[PDB]
Design a protein around this ligand. Structure first.
Ligand SMILES: [Br-]
Ligand SMILES: [Br-]
Ligand SMILES: [Br-]
Ligand SMILES: [Br-]
Ligand SMILES: [Br-]
Ligand SMILES: [Br-]
Ligand SMILES: [Br-]
Ligand SMILES: [Br-]
Ligand SMILES: [Br-]
Ligand SMILES: [Br-]
Ligand SMILES: [Br-]
Ligand SMILES: [Br-]
Ligand SMILES: [Br-]
Ligand SMILES: [Br-]
Ligand SMILES: [Br-]
Ligand SMILES: [Br-]
Ligand SMILES: [Br-]
Ligand SMILES: [Br-]
Ligand SMILES: [Br-]
Ligand SMILES: [Br-]
Ligand SMILES: [Br-]
Ligand SMILES: [Br-]
Ligand SMILES: [Br-]
Ligand SMILES: [Br-]
Ligand SMILES: [Br-]
Ligand SMILES: [Br-]
Ligand SMILES: [Br-]
Ligand SMILES: [Br-]
Ligand SMILES: [Br-]
Ligand SMILES: [Br-]
Ligand SMILES: [Br-]
Lengths: 263, 263
């Protein structure tokens, strides 16, 4: 009886809406573990005030520090004072809440390698860690996840857009994919739509992408997954609007060149 | 004009069969870059004896050392003596051939972090690197690839089976997935089918998996991708038979828990 669903039914009295939301978190948090270069555990609090670990993720972009399976672990609340308190007043372990409605419905613990063993902070690792912090804030504010097997992983290609839709960071993989798509220009410092629109092969899709990204940034649209042909290449795109305290602070875009994977 | 296809047509006189095979390599070699914790570049040799880089992959499981896009690079043969020689007589850069028919149709260069900056060799990293060596040998022998967007990545869950179908190594993620599927036992040292069969929910699928793995190990069957329900969980499995000099030396299995990704 080991799934998140079985565990939440056994140990918890969360309503079906919050149960859905936690299922959605676990369905999405590979991206968080990858961008953080960290392990996460998800903890719920029963009636008893007793704590249960109901899910766990490891990063694919670096070593785990949680080699043992933690799921199903049931622990007295005072053996984890902070986690217990995060349910209340709201490894190198950081603790953060997951909100739904306005209740903390779960708490994540983040575990990662001690300082000299970790992914040295080049630009890629900085841009990823900064995005992980943005999503952790959305988790705490109850705005991510909102409401697939094939979507890009962070390592496939990562782009950070600022509020005006200007690329503030593009990973080497993302730049690789845009070159295969026909980009002969830099990506960083350029309006993403202006760089992207001319590359897209079908003129209807070109406009769809343009409108999507405009809506994303405006708060008019949710993130989407899409497959686009450009320049002989086929890329998969996944967009994620980023928000603080009810406002848009740009977007993350994941991209995967699937030209040869497709075929 | 930046795709592998456009590049091979422009610079090469390879027959359509070998052109297919290189497309297949690029469609699959994310798994090699991930298991190697390394970058790869693919090089072809024109008429001129001049060398062209026609594809490039970075690892998702560690930092790249090739930050620049190398695709389309055209270089005199003697500026890369070894690569040139690998076409002939058959970073920390290792060079290996890709055979098709019995010709070397391309050469891979592997580039990776200098020794103190790399993924320290715990068991996971050793098991991955050993499998990468097995596939590089199959590439050199022309037996991999043979002939999807959703299949497991190496980091999702990795299992090495020996010739008798006994698990010689299972990553933490793989063990995690088998626990969600209902495994209350160790995986390492156990016959994989015997551990797996009782967990599978549908009795027809249980038998299919059993037969597949038997065929895989016998050389009676190619690798496959499959989605299975077990114990309330849903996993995606991808099998890869491993072969040296015409014989089976077991198999790699990649597994991804898609219980919450599915939903
Ligand atoms: Br993901
Ligand atoms: Br690890
Ligand atoms: Br542990
Ligand atoms: Br364990
Ligand atoms: Br704590
Ligand atoms: Br450590
Ligand atoms: Br950034
Ligand atoms: Br899918
Ligand atoms: Br825009
Ligand atoms: Br990258
Ligand atoms: Br750029
Ligand atoms: Br345009
Ligand atoms: Br335009
Ligand atoms: Br969508
Ligand atoms: Br196209
Ligand atoms: Br892969
Ligand atoms: Br990945
Ligand atoms: Br990197
Ligand atoms: Br470089
Ligand atoms: Br570049
Ligand atoms: Br060389
Ligand atoms: Br280095
Ligand atoms: Br092994
Ligand atoms: Br697919
Ligand atoms: Br067997
Ligand atoms: Br793992
Ligand atoms: Br085990
Ligand atoms: Br059975
Ligand atoms: Br059985
Ligand atoms: Br298949
Ligand atoms: Br089931």
């Amino acid at each position: 009886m080991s799934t998140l669903g079985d565990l939440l039914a056994e140990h918890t009295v969360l309503p079906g809406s919050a149960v859905d939301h936690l299922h959605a978190v676990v369905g999405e948090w590979q991206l968080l573990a990858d961008l953080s270069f960290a392990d996460y555990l998800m903890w719920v609090r029963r009636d008893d005030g007793v704590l249960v670990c109901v899910a766990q993720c490891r990063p694919n972009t670096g070593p785990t520090v949680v080699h043992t399976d933690a799921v199903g672990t049931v622990v007295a609340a005072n053996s984890m004072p902070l986690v217990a308190a995060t349910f209340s007043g709201g490894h190198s372990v950081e603790v953060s809440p997951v909100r739904f409605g306005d209740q903390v419905v779960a708490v994540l613990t983040r575990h990662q390698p001690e300082l000299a063993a970790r992914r040295r902070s080049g630009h890629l690792e900085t841009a990823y860690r900064l995005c992980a912090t943005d999503l952790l804030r959305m988790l705490a504010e109850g705005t991510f996840p909102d409401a697939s097997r094939s979507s890009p992983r962070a390592g496939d290609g990562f782009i950070r857009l600022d509020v005006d839709g200007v690329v503030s960071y593009a990973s080497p993989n993302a730049l690789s994919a845009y070159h295969r798509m026909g980009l002969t220009t830099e990506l960083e410092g350029v309006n993403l739509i202006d760089a992207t629109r001319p590359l897209i092969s079908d003129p209807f899709e070109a406009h769809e992408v343009d409108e999507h990204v405009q809506d994303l940034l405006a708060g008019d649209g949710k993130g989407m997954r899409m497959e686009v042909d450009a320049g002989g290449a086929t890329v998969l795109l996944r967009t994620l609007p980023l928000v603080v305290a009810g406002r848009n602070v740009g977007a993350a875009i994941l991209i995967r060149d699937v030209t040869e994977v497709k075929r």
